[PDB]
Amino acid sequence: XXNXXYX
Amino acid sequence: XXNXXYX
Ligand SMILES: *[C@@H]1O[C@H](CO)[C@@H](O)[C@H](O)[C@H]1O[C@H]1C[C@](C)(N)[C@H](O)[C@H](C)O1
Ligand SMILES: *[C@@H]1O[C@H](CO)[C@@H](O)[C@H](O)[C@H]1O[C@H]1C[C@](C)(N)[C@H](O)[C@H](C)O1
Ligand SMILES: [Cl-]
Ligand SMILES: [Cl-]
């Protein structure tokens, strides 16, 4: 993970 | 804004 979003 | 991140 480590990313974010939101999609 | 309203979206997220983190870049
Ligand atoms: C997403 O990251 C930001 C930055 O550190 C935090 O402020 C935010 O609380 C965090 O969102 C939580 C709540 C959410 C969106 N329901 C998810 O569970 C995420 C992974 O964590
Ligand atoms: C979104 O990220 C910023 C920067 O780290 C935080 O300061 C902020 O608290 C965070 O927003 C929260 C609250 C919100 C907007 N209701 C959402 O739940 C997000 C994911 O987390
Ligand atoms: Cl949320
Ligand atoms: Cl908002």
- Exposure of A3 in the CB half-sphere (CA atoms within 13 A): 4
- Distance CA(B7)–CA(B4), nearest Å, equals 9
> What helix, strand, coil percent values describe chain A, rounded to 5?
0, 15, 85
- Distance CA(B2)–CA(B7), nearest Å, equals 15
Resolution in A: 1.1
Method: X-ray
From chain B, the residues in CB contact with A4 under 8 A are 4-7
Q: How many CB atoms lie within 10 A of CB A7?
A: 5
Give how far the C-alpha of residue A2 lies from the chain's centroid of Cα atoms, to the nearest Å: 7
Q: How many CB atoms lie within 10 A of CB A6?
A: 7
- Distance CA(A2)–CA(B7), nearest Å, equals 10
| Dihedral sign from CA coordinates of A7, A1, B6, A4 | positive
Distance B2 CA to ligand 4 centre (A): 5
